[model samples]
Target: TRLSEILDQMTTVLNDLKTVMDAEQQQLSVGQINGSQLQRITEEKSSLLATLDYLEQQRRLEQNAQRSANDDIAERWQAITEKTQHLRDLNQHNGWLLEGQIERNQQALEVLKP
Candidate 1:
């Protein structure tokens, strides 16, 4: 029963993380960044990450018991990995967007120098 509940919560958290990541990528992709909105998204993402961290700890504890069905764990893990891959791509894209913004800022600073 404990393992079952943990798996469900894990799925729930991952889904939420994916949604948050999508929002972040959308904000980063816009021509101009909305600092306030991006800050809010960052906070949510951090909180979700902390929750995921806790879930991971609990998952490790439960793994030793060997109560869940092998097939069930396999399928659920596959779905989790699929979501994780999508998030990774989104993160990489956002990194590029931020890097571009930084380059633009550097150019602006260069122009302002006497």
Candidate 2:
């Protein structure tokens, strides 16, 4: 497979991952948590991450096979890297929210202990 094709696929996958992350963040930010919606988002995020991993592996394989790079690939690489960084930040934010939810639930359970 060509580098261009791999990058394009990664772009779409990254966008889909972002969409799921957005849904997750929104769901977490609400006053009342929706367990089922969160569960679905979690499953979808996991699947997308798996696909991204596979795509990364393929990109590396292709890169190793060819030692030279072009300007277009370089620019696209920069764009992808930036987008990935944004996703990392978003993931961290969501993780903190999740932690808060877990802590609240644990506290509630402790209060209700018999």
Candidate 3:
């Protein structure tokens, strides 16, 4: 039953992840117009990531245990995993954005080498 509850909570985390990431992109693109809004969302992103890690730790412990309860637990959990697959894309996009930021900063710094 705890595992079932965890699955439900993970669903909520997944939705929350999408919302935060979408806001992160928009906020980063805005650049000091809202100012504190970016920091607010950034803190939220960090908070959600910690929550995700905590949830994973609990879920992973159950994953290794033996199971019975109508067998649908595994099936339903797998389906929930499918639903969260979009997190991969959001993470990848974030990675790309970070990389681009790094490149742009370094390029500007290189001009000082002259």
Best by TM-score: 1
lDDT of 3 by residue, 2-105 (tens): 99999999889879967976776676663456556766777778899899889988988887788776689868888768866877788799899989988976
lDDT of 2 by residue, 15-111 (tens): 9967976776676543345555766777788899999889988898886565455448878889989998999999999989979989976886696
Instruction: For each candidate, give its TM-score against the true structure.
Output: 0.62, 0.60, 0.51
Better of 1 and 2 by TM-score: 1
The runs of at least 3 residues in candidate 1 whose Cα sits more than 4 Å from the true structure, single-residue gaps closed, are 1-35, 68-71
| Candidate 2: segments with Cα more than 4 A from true spot | 1-35, 65-71
TM-score order of candidates, best first? 1, 2, 3
Candidate 1: which pairs clash? none
Backbone clashes, candidate 3: 0
The TM-score of candidate 2 is: 0.60
Q: What is the C-alpha RMSD of each candidate to the true structure, in Å?
A: 22.6, 22.1, 21.8
